[PDB]
Write an enzyme that holds these catalytic residues in place. Structure first.
Site, PDB file in Angstrom:
ATOM      1  N   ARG A  45      -3.579  -5.204 -26.782  1.00 11.58           N
ATOM      2  CA  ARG A  45      -2.441  -5.872 -27.168  1.00 11.58           C
ATOM      3  C   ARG A  45      -2.550  -7.444 -27.290  1.00 11.58           C
ATOM      4  O   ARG A  45      -1.897  -8.108 -28.332  1.00 11.58           O
ATOM      5  CB  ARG A  45      -1.201  -5.872 -26.026  1.00 11.58           C
ATOM      6  N   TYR A  91      -1.832  -9.847 -30.660  1.00 13.49           N
ATOM      7  CA  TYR A  91      -0.915 -11.206 -30.547  1.00 13.49           C
ATOM      8  C   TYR A  91      -1.766 -12.467 -31.074  1.00 13.49           C
ATOM      9  O   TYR A  91      -1.016 -13.339 -31.554  1.00 13.49           O
ATOM     10  CB  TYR A  91      -0.686 -11.426 -29.230  1.00 13.49           C
ATOM     11  N   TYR A 110      12.254  -9.148 -32.185  1.00 11.77           N
ATOM     12  CA  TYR A 110      13.231  -8.020 -31.269  1.00 11.77           C
ATOM     13  C   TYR A 110      13.877  -8.953 -30.022  1.00 11.77           C
ATOM     14  O   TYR A 110      12.961  -9.522 -29.114  1.00 11.77           O
ATOM     15  CB  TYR A 110      12.746  -6.977 -30.757  1.00 11.77           C
ATOM     16  N   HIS A 133      15.646 -11.645 -27.629  1.00  4.48           N
ATOM     17  CA  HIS A 133      15.361 -13.290 -27.564  1.00  4.48           C
ATOM     18  C   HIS A 133      13.863 -13.223 -27.676  1.00  4.48           C
ATOM     19  O   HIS A 133      13.035 -12.531 -27.078  1.00  4.48           O
ATOM     20  CB  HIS A 133      15.561 -13.506 -26.056  1.00  4.48           C
ATOM     21  N   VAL A 135      11.510 -14.005 -24.379  1.00  3.18           N
ATOM     22  CA  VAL A 135      11.536 -13.158 -23.321  1.00  3.18           C
ATOM     23  C   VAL A 135      10.720 -11.815 -23.300  1.00  3.18           C
ATOM     24  O   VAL A 135      10.865 -11.081 -24.152  1.00  3.18           O
ATOM     25  CB  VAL A 135      12.837 -12.838 -23.152  1.00  3.18           C
ATOM     26  N   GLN A 171       9.818  -3.272 -18.306  1.00  2.87           N
ATOM     27  CA  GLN A 171       8.679  -2.411 -18.348  1.00  2.87           C
ATOM     28  C   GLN A 171       8.336  -1.406 -17.327  1.00  2.87           C
ATOM     29  O   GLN A 171       7.030  -1.250 -17.159  1.00  2.87           O
ATOM     30  CB  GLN A 171       7.467  -3.315 -18.637  1.00  2.87           C
ATOM     31  N   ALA A 180      20.301  -0.036 -23.347  1.00  2.00           N
ATOM     32  CA  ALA A 180      21.504  -0.660 -24.167  1.00  2.00           C
ATOM     33  C   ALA A 180      21.284   0.138 -25.650  1.00  2.00           C
ATOM     34  O   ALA A 180      20.011   0.719 -25.863  1.00  2.00           O
ATOM     35  CB  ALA A 180      20.932  -2.113 -24.605  1.00  2.00           C
ATOM     36  N   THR A 196      15.132   0.275 -18.506  1.00  2.00           N
ATOM     37  CA  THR A 196      15.199  -1.035 -17.672  1.00  2.00           C
ATOM     38  C   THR A 196      15.868  -0.370 -16.475  1.00  2.00           C
ATOM     39  O   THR A 196      16.804   0.318 -16.456  1.00  2.00           O
ATOM     40  CB  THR A 196      16.102  -2.393 -18.147  1.00  2.00           C
TER      41      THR A 196
END
Ligand SMILES: Nc1ncnc2c1ncn2[C@@H]1O[C@H](CSCC[C@H](N)C(=O)O)[C@@H](O)[C@H]1O
Ligand SMILES: Nc1ncnc2c1ncn2[C@@H]1O[C@H](CSCC[C@H](N)C(=O)O)[C@@H](O)[C@H]1O
Lengths: 377, 360
Positions: free
Chosen positions: A66, A70, A92, A94, A97, A166, A207, A239
């Site tokens: 990862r 990045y 995706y 904010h 965050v 996570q 969500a 979450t």
């Protein structure tokens, strides 16, 4: 000053609708747009707003770290900045965050002298407060990444809210296209049983990502998490919310030094109760003093110090324009006086207040308050 | 049953930080109740619906905040009880440090009415963006300042700390010209007992107008005692207190489970990290040869399909029709292919992906 800039914005969580008006306007005004979103409707939407777009998602891969991905995503963005272009990055939720590549790219642009800014967006935790009907202010909120929680042994509080991100990726530093195996999930459940106890509730939260879906708000015991039918439900966008175990007593010395209650009495909730806590003594919505407050509405008039809005079409149009048109805003910031002189239809009072730009001046202008200085315009 | 209550936010910075969905519900509502602290935002709301009431008029000098909140919620719920579609609008995120919204939604729900909160951008969200920090590394504790002192809530010196309502410590009242913050010294004492006297405290105020810059002023805990500094802390003030040290890793946990750039600029005495280390330069080298992996699925949709998925997010009435009857709604959308209609009828995320990425 140097030419070229980087603005990083969010899309929110629920497809399209949770994007802010300012994020949309910067996407449209960009010379070039880089995006990383997990929803095809949101991707399709972004593509209709700008002709020069690149999908960053293609730089993820099986058996590719990862951190490598990045570094690559951030370098793609900053290369376009160094060519003199106004660049926008889109992530995706904010975009600051749980997002590595945006902070990297902004700090690089900043250190090399380019204008660099992050615009906030709606996070998964914002959606969680809304859907579970809780306030982070009562009784406080602890927020952690689930692996970091365990590795660094970070302290919980049984008297405050706990949110864990996570929870479907416990101890995984790689990416996998087709999802993962969350075989290390059991280390987390043991920790929760230790801190809270076996019968304590934990809410599994997902969500809604599409506008027609309902949120997953399923309450389990910590012991129920060991059962395999329940464990497989936990995935990459899951979450955990863990409510408090008990209410914490008030510090008697501080309640004295802030002088809220007289001595001799005791401070033994406010409506409504946190629905997810165990053994919640229910609260009544229409107590006697609530009913007296409701009866006062018949003879309510605005207090003397209340100042109603009293503005013009021309002033409202320009303040809206500054918030929705980045190029108009840039022109205003470069020379307040010149910009103010060329706005159509403003009164002299309104021109002078926009020229100053201060909060007290805009308020005077839009609430028809007397100012000695501004009335002489 | 007839009647609904939807509560939405405006965000912090005037107008621009409202969500697309919040605007669409404001426009579709039969009645609007709002509480905002910026005249440009108030003016904008009034252009989007003809039937608005300002809730700010129910505050008063010396009048209880709780009486004000009971009034605000009852005004909203009375309109719901007449079978109307009602929208409440609050500053920021409408459930973050806000009482009347939670109360009104729970009353509406207990009497059998449809009731939902839509999230918005909070003062904490702005703080993360303007201070350039991430709450994931190394954790974030968020408290109301008075509740922090009264309940003696724990600090974690290895994590981010954020304190809301620092400009009114111990105050339950409202006043139009603000209040003097005379109990402020009780917060400072607790901070110095927990962190050092030379430990940094960042005084944060997000910009409220689009042209303004944020306040991000770094002070020591001790220099908060200076009266010129303490007067600057007001009703829209928030404190960020960075970590004092790094927490040690747990050796046992590491077995069972089998610095990096950039550094937090507010932590005292942290060496900055190199952005372009050799592992980074090797990552960058691979971009010359990069091809998209075989499992990468590019977007491959139609105009008709994209227009309908956008319409469901931006038009609350179209969404209501779709939820009531998936099949009938899918049949009435012009220009979809047969594949696109069946996928809309199912509506599951896997179905929509198939249609919009033409997967076999
Ligand atoms: N739909 C959803 N419901 C609940 N949590 C979610 C979610 N989508 C993402 N998350 C959380 O966020 C993590 C992804 S990392 C990206 C987070 C994003 N920047 C944000 O603003 O929230 C996941 O591990 C999960 O814990
Ligand atoms: N412009 C601003 N900058 C920083 N903090 C702010 C702010 N406006 C409000 N706040 C914080 O929030 C408190 C008001 S309570 C209402 C908060 C709002 N619903 C939200 O989502 O943020 C203040 O005491 C302050 O701590």
């Amino acid at each position: 000053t140097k030419a070229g800039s980087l603005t990083i914005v969010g899309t929110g969580i629920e497809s399209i609708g949770q994007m802010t008006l300012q994020a949309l306007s910067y996407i449209e005004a960009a010379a070039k747009v880089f995006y990383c979103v997990i929803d095809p409707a949101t991707e399709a939407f972004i593509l209709t707003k700008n002709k020069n777009c690149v999908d960053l998602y293609q730089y993820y891969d099986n058996g590719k770290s990862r951190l490598n991905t990045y570094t690559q995503m951030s370098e793609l963005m900053v290369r376009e900045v160094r060519k003199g272009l106004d660049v926008v990055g889109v992530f995706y939720g904010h975009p600051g965050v749980f997002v590595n590549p945006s902070h990297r790219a902004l700090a690089i642009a900043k250190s090399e002298g380019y204008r660099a800014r992050m615009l906030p967006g709606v996070s998964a935790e914002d959606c969680l407060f809304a859907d579970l009907c809780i306030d982070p202010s009562n009784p406080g909120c602890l927020t952690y990444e689930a692996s970091d929680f365990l590795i660094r042994d970070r302290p919980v509080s049984i008297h405050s809210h706990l949110v864990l991100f996570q929870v479907g990726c416990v101890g995984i530093a790689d990416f996998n296209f087709t999802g993962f195996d969350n075989n290390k999930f059991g280390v987390l459940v043991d920790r929760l049983e230790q801190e809270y106890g076996a019968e304590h509730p934990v809410v599994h939260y997902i969500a809604a990502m599409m506008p027609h879906q309902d949120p997953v708000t399923d309450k389990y015991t910590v012991a129920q998490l060991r059962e395999p039918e329940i464990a497989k439900r936990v995935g990459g966008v899951s979450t955990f919310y863990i409510p408090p175990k008990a209410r914490k007593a008030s510090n008697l010395d501080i309640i004295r030094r802030l002088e809220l209650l007289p001595a001799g009495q005791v401070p033994d909730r406010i409506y409504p109760a946190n629905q997810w806590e165990p053994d919640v003594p229910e609260v009544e919505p229409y107590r006697p003093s609530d009913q007296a407050a409701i009866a006062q509405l018949a003879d309510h008039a605005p207090p003397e110090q209340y100042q109603p809005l009293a503005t013009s079409k021309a002033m409202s149009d320009v303040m809206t324009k500054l918030a929705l048109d980045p190029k108009a805003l840039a022109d205003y910031k470069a020379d307040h006086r010149a910009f103010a002189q060329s706005v159509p239809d403003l009164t002299p009072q309104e021109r002078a207040a926009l020229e100053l730009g201060d909060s007290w001046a805009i308020r005077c202008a839009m609430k028809n308050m007397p100012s000695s200085l501004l009335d002489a315009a």
